[PDB]
Amino acid sequence: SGAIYVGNYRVVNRHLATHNDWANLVWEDSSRDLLVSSTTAQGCDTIARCDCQTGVYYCSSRRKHYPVSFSKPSLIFVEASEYYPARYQSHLMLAVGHSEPGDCGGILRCQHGVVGIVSTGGNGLVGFADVRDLLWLDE
Ligand SMILES: NC(=O)[C@H]1CCCN(C(=O)Cc2ccnc(O)c2Br)C1
Ligand SMILES: [Zn+2]
């Protein structure tokens, strides 16, 4: 679990969005595993606007943060799950690191701010949904 709170927006994994997220929907994209909902309170986070390919992510299944080198956002095949059929997930960045299903929502940050959230994993890999291209989150 986990979310990004920026301005009057809450960014979560689309597959973990609640009834309240859907009732306050701003934007969603199944191909990216992202959903953004509106909030009444001002949020705590800053979004990175950069091309960093190193950062640190929070891994809830270890209660620890890990440094990672990750690939640039790209279209990656993701096997079928209870949430989605087998498909290509876009804007996804991979890195070597530990990740279990409940780790989705953990934040990846670089020195400039929030880069993305954990969205996939397995076999010593961790995948992050990028949010750096969503410029409207800042306005
Ligand atoms: N399609 C998706 O973005 C995910 C939806 C939930 C399922 N999914 C995963 O990758 C689940 C996952 C996450 C983290 N570490 C793991 O070892 C595993 Br398996 C795929
Ligand atoms: Zn950066």
65 is in an annotated binding site: no
User: Which tokens belong to 93?
Assistant: 């960045």
Structure-determination technique? X-ray
Residue 106 phi/psi, 5-degree rounding, is: -60, 135
Contact yes or no for 6/45 (Cβ under 8 A): yes
CB of 103 shorter than 6 A to ligand 1:
yes
CB of 29 shorter than 6 A to ligand 1:
no
50 is in an annotated binding site: yes
Contact yes or no for 121/100 (Cβ under 8 A): yes
44 CA to centre of ligand 1 in angstroms: 26
Distance separating alpha carbons of residues 46 and 27, to the nearest angstrom: 19
The residue extents of the domains of the chain are: 3-44, 45-139
Closest of 111, 91, 70, 77 to residue 13, by C-alpha? 91
Residue 22 is given by DSSP the state: H
Closest of 119, 117, 82 to residue 100, by C-alpha? 119
Based on C-alpha coordinates, what's the Rg of the chain? 14
User: Which tokens belong to 39?
Assistant: 């909030």
CB of 15 shorter than 6 A to ligand 1:
yes
